[PDB]
From a paper:
Like RNase A, ANG cleaves preferentially on the 3′ side of pyrimidines and follows a transphosphorylation/hydrolysis mechanism. The enzymatic activity of ANG is several orders of magnitude lower than that of RNase A towards conventional RNase substrates, but essential for its angiogenic effect.
ANG residues H13, K40 and H114 (part of the P1 sub-site) correspond to the catalytic triad. In the native structure, Nδ1 of H13 forms a hydrogen bond with the main-chain O of T44 and Nε2 makes a water-mediated interaction with the amide nitrogen atom of L115. The interaction with Q117 (known to be the obstructive pyrimidine-binding site residue in ANG)642 seem to result with slight rearrangement of the C-terminal helix. In addition, in the variant, the Arg side chain is not optimally positioned to interact with the two other catalytically important residues K40 and H114. This provides a structural explanation for the dramatic loss of RNase activity observed in this variant.
Residue numbers in the entry: 4 to 121
The structure:
């Protein structure tokens, strides 16, 4: 439930571009444009690795009740451009590659900490 919603909001397995136009498309596809979300980051790659963050084989405890990954992931950060509060929402894409901070419930990721992505 919260896991499927995490994936919806935060996981794109195999993107192609990761350019501005990619962000604008996926923010709409995934229902993050009512209202226009200020910033959102998607994790790429394989799903079992992200699940693994909630175990000891890919995660460490972090701050208050979070977990931070041992391995790095391809990520894309979509940053709202030009103050649109409601659609059409315009976005600027920054691709990166780093470890990720999540929260886990019942051994599955359910929240992504945006703050590590500026």
């Amino acid at each position: 439930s919260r896991y499927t919603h995490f994936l919806t909001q935060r996981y794109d397995a195999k993107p192609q571009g990761r350019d501005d136009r990619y962000c604008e498309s996926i923010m709409r596809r995934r229902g993050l444009t009512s209202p226009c979300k200020d910033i959102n980051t998607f994790i790429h790659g394989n799903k079992r690795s992200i699940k693994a963050i909630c175990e000891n084989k890919n995660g460490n405890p972090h701050r208050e009740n979070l977990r931070i990954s041992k391995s790095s992931f391809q990520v894309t950060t979509c940053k709202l451009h030009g103050g649109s509060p409601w659609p059409p929402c315009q976005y600027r894409a920054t691709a990166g590659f780093r470890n990720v901070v999540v929260a886990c419930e019942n051994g599955l990721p359910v929240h992504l900490d945006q703050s590590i992505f500026r």
